[PDB]
Write a protein that binds this ligand. Structure first.
Ligand SMILES: *[C@@H]1O[C@H](CO)[C@@H](O[C@@H]2O[C@H](CO)[C@@H](O[C@@H]3O[C@H](CO[C@H]4O[C@H](CO)[C@@H](O)[C@H](O[C@H]5O[C@H](CO)[C@@H](O)[C@H](O)[C@@H]5O)[C@@H]4O)[C@@H](O)[C@H](O[C@H]4O[C@H](CO)[C@@H](O)[C@H](O)[C@@H]4O)[C@@H]3O)[C@H](O)[C@H]2NC(C)=O)[C@H](O)[C@H]1NC(C)=O
Ligand SMILES: *[C@@H]1O[C@H](CO)[C@@H](O[C@@H]2O[C@H](CO)[C@@H](O[C@@H]3O[C@H](CO)[C@@H](O)[C@H](O)[C@@H]3O)[C@H](O)[C@H]2NC(C)=O)[C@H](O)[C@H]1NC(C)=O
Ligand SMILES: *[C@@H]1O[C@H](CO)[C@@H](O[C@@H]2O[C@H](CO)[C@@H](O)[C@H](O)[C@H]2NC(C)=O)[C@H](O)[C@H]1NC(C)=O
Ligand SMILES: *[C@@H]1O[C@H](CO)[C@@H](O[C@@H]2O[C@H](CO)[C@@H](O)[C@H](O)[C@H]2NC(C)=O)[C@H](O)[C@H]1NC(C)=O
Ligand SMILES: *[C@@H]1O[C@H](CO)[C@@H](O[C@@H]2O[C@H](CO)[C@@H](O)[C@H](O)[C@H]2NC(C)=O)[C@H](O)[C@H]1NC(C)=O
Ligand SMILES: *[C@@H]1O[C@H](CO)[C@@H](O[C@@H]2O[C@H](CO)[C@@H](O)[C@H](O)[C@H]2NC(C)=O)[C@H](O)[C@H]1NC(C)=O
Ligand SMILES: *[C@@H]1O[C@H](CO)[C@@H](O)[C@H](O)[C@H]1NC(C)=O
Ligand SMILES: *[C@@H]1O[C@H](CO)[C@@H](O)[C@H](O)[C@H]1NC(C)=O
Ligand SMILES: [Ca+2]
Ligand SMILES: [Ca+2]
Ligand SMILES: [Ca+2]
Ligand SMILES: [Ca+2]
Ligand SMILES: [Mn+2]
Ligand SMILES: [Mn+2]
Ligand SMILES: [Mn+2]
Lengths: 65, 361, 446
């Protein structure tokens, strides 16, 4: 249902800024408290695909049902 | 009969350089000596740059800052020494992912990164800037787990490792770059490290090896060693972490905090201001004096401050563009020999010197 | 002033084993427990697994036999012991610092292993959750309690929890554990009674969820690197009889640090106590006792790295200890009294402990450690007496090691524990850890 991305612990914030820009360009709403980027209202298949891609990139992400 | 005075040869800025004195018994002869400092100060600088994974966004700024700093050192002073080092964090379990795969490349799998290292002295101090530009350009990032980085170990080793780093008896500077906070003493207990940092130099092959054996140093320890070695620290930290390092600046005397960005004017301006504020002391010496001859000194320091006796030989505050005036009186109780004599009066640690010729009637 | 410092009983363990790193009493007769983080163990394939030594009292204190809390070595991995090439331990018990925190209450014992780490089945990541064993009813049965060994794998969750870093037993037997490294080093306080652990125990599955467990919730990302739970203590601050938790946060507020008081039934923060100086470890060690004898517990907070200007203006590292007295309305935010060290790099206030009514005047006393104090930097332990106006500002007694200084620091006074009538003569006694030279001296009150 929801995808969480953690840009913390010795990680360049420019990465999180560019992911926020990329997802926002595709119309998926995005919010962030300080560096915890999350996606709201995303389908299960799309969320799983994005999570797999980001894990391949090496970012730690979590999926919430 | 009476004494006389005259100057043989004089030069404009040590204004008088050759004069002859026709002394007499019981009649002092006094002459003036004007000094103005013109030699440029010598300077040493060591640039310490973070290289944790958080530096990926800021690496270009660090490199450009290095080149601009070298250019300013060349432009401002004719004598300069420059070198640099790097650091990420202690190499123990809580601070680095210790799985065998991630020792090879703690960054992401796609990227290639060098393995972590507590501290690596890349280049000892040297007077040639071309190697500094060439070698800084080859640096590559390295990975680490926790957001704070172990820079204080690097600062400790740089402060205490005198000969290996190449520090000399000269004004010293140390530019520190980082995108994240800092560890300090007491953090090592998480990784089972409890021995406090002894402050000794444990560099082997230009690398810190006892990172896993000694805890981080406390700020008081760091302050003590920096003050002992007379190193002025300049923190070229990112705009994000300005408040924490500003609070740190109060504890450490004689330091300033700049801003790290594509535009590097702030830290350069701090360097120039630090150079301009330097000052020296002028102390006048003289060669061995013949018996039956006595000398005295007077000092006219800046702001009208004046001294006599021993204080006449010394002026404890002088900077570029400043000048001082000395009054020296020479007296003789007899005439040891008809033939004249030559004596040299020069300030300590300078090449320029005065020659005085004494004649006894 | 009556601790018999002329010839205290001395205990010694194997060399280079950090014997005496953490000490505690035991009284199911009476005996003294000593932790040995680096001592070798007989379990197979474990290098420096660590052990806890039981040194009985009354007889000649010279047995000091170890306790076989565990015997199985590094446990293997299911689906890799067979149908795969080679073995792969699922948990790495080597260098786990077992026994780094020995706490006992009645017949139960808790021995935590902060550095225990384990490779997950889903992915090969290895993280140090830490684990604690729990003996119950005089070693009748032993339960492994590892609440941070949950399904949240990486440091983003409870992966790097290092649970069991600091622990304490409440009056009702409820266990408390301080995990500093949970949630990107935000820290976490975990607790659950012995009954709940026994009910939810299931050794077959490495991942077990204890029913009724209480734990702090994850906070915003701004609070990273707080190290909450670096040091833990318990006292009655909420007015109700239920014991309330106290947790140290040495790096919570721009490294100034603070100490929190958590409700003992919900873990909702009740008070905050800000630090004084940047990077001082305000919260290195905490304690709660009734120093002024009013009947309400009073907080004490350590700060070893605090520096102050010398008489000539030179800054020096002395350390400081603060005292907050609980008025009937509620604890004040400012420190009612502060005690400062004298030795440079002394780490004064790095280990606190109540002593009970040692002087026997109706007022409780307190002992404050100083691992690197003294002329030779061997270490020193002070004893500050209580009184109606609060804790006295002049140490009543000063305790130093008898043996000559070696080539390495002794860390004398780095771990203390007192307030139990060990000798049985009706006065409290003190145990001082000296793990630098692998010794743990015991003092007795005349
Ligand atoms: C003593 O000092 C300490 C340290 O300053 C204080 O502790 C911190 O106080 C702050 C402020 O009160 C806390 O932040 C608030 O936390 C609560 C509770 O959050 C938890 O429960 C939520 C229940 O709804 C839950 O949603 C949260 O989880 C989500 O959100 C967090 C973000 O925190 C996110 O990281 C998670 O992944 C989840 O997505 C969490 O489990 C929360 O209700 C508050 O939310 C407010 O948010 C905005 C402002 O951010 C506001 O507009 C809203 O209306 C809402 O009120 C806020 O996040 C913090 O958690 C405390 N702990 C720490 C470690 O920082 C303590 O309070 C002081 N005590 C005293 C007595 O002074
Ligand atoms: C627990 O037991 C293990 C295994 O017996 C001990 O391992 C030993 O550790 C020491 C130091 O870490 C090693 O010492 C080195 O030995 C070589 C040759 O033996 C010597 O040339 C070196 O100078 C150094 O002294 C030692 O090899 C190693 N193994 C053995 C069998 O001793 C470990 O030290 C024990 N731990 C404690 C706290 O006693
Ligand atoms: C960095 O920014 C500062 C301020 O924005 C620039 O400062 C100006 O520099 C020019 C010459 O480079 C001067 O003529 C101006 O007087 C300066 N103004 C101020 C307010 O400082 C600086 O130039 C920038 N750096 C670079 C390399 O362009
Ligand atoms: C509680 O357990 C301890 C540990 O076994 C008992 O103390 C001694 O343990 C050693 C083995 O380590 C035995 O050899 C001794 O015989 C034990 N003491 C006695 C008096 O038997 C202890 O006895 C146990 N508690 C009780 C009440 O027996
Ligand atoms: C600490 O928490 C306890 C409960 O966990 C509070 O005590 C009572 O809790 C019940 C519910 O369990 C409430 O209905 C009561 O209202 C609580 N008592 C009061 C006086 O409100 C206790 O209040 C909490 N501590 C503080 C200081 O509020
Ligand atoms: C967090 O730290 C800040 C900075 O120390 C505190 O803000 C003020 O800090 C100064 C220190 O120079 C104190 O004199 C003030 O009293 C502090 N302000 C207040 C309102 O007390 C801030 O208080 C700290 N907050 C917490 C929760 O620890
Ligand atoms: C110092 O000497 C200068 C030069 O003679 C004179 O003008 C000035 O008044 C003197 N000041 C003092 C304080 O003696
Ligand atoms: C030292 O000399 C400089 C320049 O001559 C002057 O600005 C300064 O006031 C003098 N005194 C001190 C204490 O720096
Ligand atoms: Ca309560
Ligand atoms: Ca009280
Ligand atoms: Ca008393
Ligand atoms: Ca007694
Ligand atoms: Mn970093
Ligand atoms: Mn960055
Ligand atoms: Mn780090």
């Amino acid at each position: 249902s929801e995808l969480i991305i953690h840009g913390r612990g010795d990680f360049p914030s420019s990465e999180l800024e560019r992911l926020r820009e990329r997802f926002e360009r595709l119309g998926i709403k995005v919010r962030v408290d300080h560096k915890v980027l999350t996606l709201i209202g995303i389908s299960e298949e799309e969320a799983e695909r994005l999570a797999r891609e980001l894990r391949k990139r090496g970012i730690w992400v979590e999926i919430r049902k | 009969p009476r004494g006389s005075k005259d100057i043989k040869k004089n030069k404009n800025v040590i204004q008088p350089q050759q004069l002859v004195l026709r002394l007499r018994s019981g009649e002092p002869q006094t002459f003036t000596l004007k000094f103005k400092r013109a030699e440029d100060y010598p300077i040493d600088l060591y640039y310490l740059m973070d290289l944790s994974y958080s530096m990926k966004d800021d690496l270009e700024n660090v490199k450009s800052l290095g080149t601009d700093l070298m250019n300013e050192m060349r432009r401002i002073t004719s004598d300069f020494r420059i070198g640099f080092g790097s650091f990420v964090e202690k190499t123990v379990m809580p601070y680095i992912s210790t799985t065998p795969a991630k020792l090879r490349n703690p960054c992401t799998s796609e990227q290639n990164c060098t393995s972590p290292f507590s501290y690596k002295n890349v280049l000892s101090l040297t007077n040639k800037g071309e190697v500094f530009n060439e070698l800084v350009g080859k640096q590559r990032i390295s990975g680490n787990l926790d957001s704070p980085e172990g820079g204080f170990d690097a600062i400790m080793q740089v402060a205490v490792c005198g000969s290996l780093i190449g520090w000399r008896n000269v004004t010293r500077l140390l530019v520190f770059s980082t995108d994240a906070g800092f560890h300090f003493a007491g953090d090592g207990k998480l990784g089972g490290i409890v021995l406090p940092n002894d402050g000794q130099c444990h560099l082997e092959n230009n690398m810190y090896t006892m990172s896993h054996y000694y805890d981080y140093p406390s700020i008081a320890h760091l302050v003590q060693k920096l003050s002992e070695n007379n190193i002025q620290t300049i923190f070229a930290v990112t705009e994000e972490f300005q408040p924490v390092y500003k609070e740190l600046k109060n504890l450490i005397p004689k330091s300033a905090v700049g801003t790290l960005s594509a535009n590097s004017s702030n830290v350069i301006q701090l360097i120039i201001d630090a150079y301009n504020s330097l000052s020296s002391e002028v102390i006048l010496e003289n060669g061995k004096l013949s018996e039956g001859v006595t000398i005295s000194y007077k000092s006219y320091c800046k702001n009208g401050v004046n001294g006599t006796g021993e204080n006449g030989r010394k002026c404890s505050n002088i900077s570029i563009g400043d000048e001082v005036q000395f009054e020296i009186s020479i007296t003789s109780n007899k005439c040891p020999k008809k033939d004249s004599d030559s004596f040299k009066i020069r300030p300590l640690g300078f090449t320029e010197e005065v020659e005085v010729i004494l004649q006894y009637i | 002033f009556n601790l018999d410092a002329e010839a205290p009983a001395v205990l010694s363990g194997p060399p280079g084993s950090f014997f005496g790193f953490s000490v505690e009493f035991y009284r199911p007769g009476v005996s003294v427990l000593v932790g040995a983080p680096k001592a070798n163990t007989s379990q197979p394939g474990v290098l420096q697994g660590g052990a806890v030594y039981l040194c009985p009292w009354g007889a000649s204190p010279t047995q000091c036999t170890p306790i076989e809390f565990d015997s199985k070595g590094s446990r293997l991995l299911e689906s890799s012991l067979s149908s795969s090439e080679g073995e792969e331990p699922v948990e790495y018990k080597s260098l786990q610092w077992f026994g780094a925190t020995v706490r006992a209450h009645g017949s139960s014992i808790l021995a935590c292993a902060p550095l225990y780490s384990w490779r997950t089945e889903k992915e090969p990541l290895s993280d140090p959750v830490g684990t604690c064993y729990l003996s119950t009813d005089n070693f009748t049965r032993i339960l492994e309690y590892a609440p941070c060994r949950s399904d949240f794998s990486w440091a983003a969750g409870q992966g790097y929890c290092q649970g069991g870093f600091s622990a304490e037993f409440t009056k009702t037997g409820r266990v408390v554990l301080g995990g500093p490294g949970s949630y990107f080093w935000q820290g976490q306080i975990l607790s659950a009674t012995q009954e709940q652990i026994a009910e939810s125990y299931y050794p077959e599955y490495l991942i077990n969820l204890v029913q009724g467990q209480l734990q702090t919730r994850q906070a915003s990302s701004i609070y990273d690197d707080s190290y909450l739970g670096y040091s833990v203590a318990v006292g009655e601050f909420s007015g109700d009889d239920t014991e309330d938790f106290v947790a140290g946060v040495p790096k919570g507020n721009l490294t100034y640090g603070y100490v929190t008081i958590l409700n003992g039934s919900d873990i909702r923060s009740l008070y905050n106590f800000s630090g004084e100086q940047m990077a001082s470890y305000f919260g290195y060690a905490v304690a709660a006792t009734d120093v002024n004898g009013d009947g309400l517990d009073d907080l004490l907070v350590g700060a070893p790295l605090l520096m102050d200007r010398t008489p000539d203006g030179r800054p020096q590292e002395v350390g400081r200890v603060y005292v907050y007295l609980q008025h009937p309305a509620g604890i004040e935010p400012t420190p009612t009294l502060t005690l400062t060290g004298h030795d440079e790099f002394g780490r004064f206030g790095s280990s606190l402990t109540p002593l009970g009514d040692l002087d026997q005047d109706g007022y409780n006393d307190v002992a404050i450690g100083a691992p690197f104090g003294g002329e030779t930097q061997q270490g020193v332990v002070f004893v500050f007496p209580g009184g109606p106006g609060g804790l006295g500002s002049k140490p009543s007694q000063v305790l130093q090691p008898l043996w000559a200084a070696s080539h390495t620091p002794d860390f004398f006074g780095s771990a203390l524990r007192g307030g139990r009538d060990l000798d049985g003569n009706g006065y409290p006694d003190l145990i001082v850890g000296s793990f630098g030279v692998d010794k743990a001296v015991v003092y007795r009150g005349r």
